[PDB]
Design a protein around this nucleic acid. Sequence first.
RNA 1: AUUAAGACAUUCGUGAGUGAUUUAUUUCCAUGAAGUGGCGU
Length: 118
Amino acid sequence: MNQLTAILKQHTPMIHFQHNESGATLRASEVKPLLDKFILTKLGNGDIREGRLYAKKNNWLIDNEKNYALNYKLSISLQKKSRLEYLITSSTFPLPTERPSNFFTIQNSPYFAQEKCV
RNA sequence: AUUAAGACAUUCGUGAGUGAUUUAUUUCCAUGAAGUGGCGU
């Protein structure tokens, strides 16, 4: 058809640099390029060039000569904005007891940047 | 003193009336705010 709607389930928290916005969610500006590369690779059976030729055929390309981009629109929307925020550090630090309801901590995590927050 | 003399092709008259430089045309396409720990062996 024209529209493809999918509902996603989050398994691990996402480190988002635009957390200040209420509606902040997974940005399509990462998913769409990665999705394009994945779809082209699977179209060519492990060869992105054969997949790009296949997508040049059937006119599935915005940019027949230039890019890897396919002709579709990606929109990622939050249905309900109950955000569950996390603090991630690579060091073990004592946990306080004065927090908002949606503040949780992950300690001794691989994410080592932002270690000066404690 | 002679088939002569006399007589403005002149008067009046607005190059004018009606008339959108307008119909149509996406400042768009592309792109991961992301990479990485180390000593304390």
